Design a protein around this ligand. Structure first.
Ligand SMILES: COc1cccc(C(=O)c2sc(Nc3ccccc3)nc2N)c1
Length: 282
């Protein structure tokens, strides 16, 4: 187009097609996302001012010929592909730990700036050859808002709560952490109810004891089956107790009891964190 050269279609994003493109003027390659409101323009534009090592930079918001494009710094590979590529032997624990640590740093930053992601998934976690991992698309959900993956959706969202909190991002990261460790999605639901019951079958059907206010949620039904909680040691076996304790805190039903990114960074699991180099096949 006028100021870009579409190198390739890197895929279908939440709001539209995403292409690997090259800016004709600078020659820089970026991830150009076509969006499929004047308030959205204002909000999104504010996001350009979010700089952190673990957040994919939003270089530009382009509103021309009545189309909306978001220009992002280009990263080497997404975690989804990396996990698939590492499925035979699994991502080494030190690297899993480094990634979780960095992602929490990115979340702690966004959240301290009152920005939520709401749709964290391996597809929007990007890595580079130097061992960094970054979160892409923070704050787009709020600015915009509505086959979609439900695997990383927090239970409060599934139960129809209309007010999101920073806790939904911790839940999603918890699901991703488990998946890196076991090499299998933690809650692979095929529908909203299947997603919810898969969570219930593992963590136990929530009640007013563990989640005060749950029985009054919009889509909660007294007729939900009552499953008992499974022992955590069976959920992510290869993980040591520090990792399991941290994961359990990231998967608390009550958003208010769920650990914050900031507090998670101080968890004992990270006492020996390092920054390994991943073996990336580009
Ligand atoms: C469907 O497309 C998506 C979905 C969610 C996030 C992004 C995104 O921001 C990206 S992808 C990317 N490089 C990349 C290089 C090789 C393989 C896959 C992605 N770099 C950025 N910045 C793209």
């Amino acid at each position: 187009m006028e100021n870009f050269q579409k190198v390739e279609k890197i895929g279908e994003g939440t709001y539209g097609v995403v292409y690997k493109a090259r800016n004709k003027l600078t020659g820089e390659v970026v991830a150009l996302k076509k969006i499929r409101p004047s308030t959205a323009i204002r909000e999104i534009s504010l996001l350009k001012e979010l700089n952190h090592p673990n957040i994919v930079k939003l270089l530009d918001v382009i509103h021309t010929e009545n189309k909306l494009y978001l220009v992002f710094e280009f990263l080497h590979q997404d975690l989804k592909k990396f996990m698939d590529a590492s499925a035979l032997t699994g991502i080494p624990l030190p690297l899993i730990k480094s990634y979780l640590f960095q992602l929490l740093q990115g979340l702690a930053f966004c959240h301290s700036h009152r920005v939520l992601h709401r749709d964290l998934k391996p597809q929007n976690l990007l890595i580079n050859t130097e061992g960094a991992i970054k979160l892409a698309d923070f704050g787009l959900a709020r600015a915009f808002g509505v086959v979609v993956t439900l695997w990383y959706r927090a239970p409060e969202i599934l139960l129809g709560c209309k007010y999101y909190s920073t806790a939904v991002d911790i839940w999603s990261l918890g699901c991703i952490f488990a998946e890196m460790v076991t090499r299998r999605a933690l809650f692979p639901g095929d529908s909203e109810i299947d997603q919810l019951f898969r969570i219930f079958r593992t963590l136990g059907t929530p009640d007013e004891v563990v989640w005060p206010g749950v029985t009054s949620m919009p889509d909660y039904k007294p007729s939900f089956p009552k499953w008992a909680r499974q022992d955590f040691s069976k959920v992510v076996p290869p993980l040591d107790e520090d990792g399991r304790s941290l994961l359990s805190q990231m998967l608390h039903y009550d958003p208010n009891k769920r650990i914050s990114a900031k507090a998670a960074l101080a968890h004992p699991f990270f006492q020996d964190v390092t920054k390994p180099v991943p073996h990336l096949r580009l």
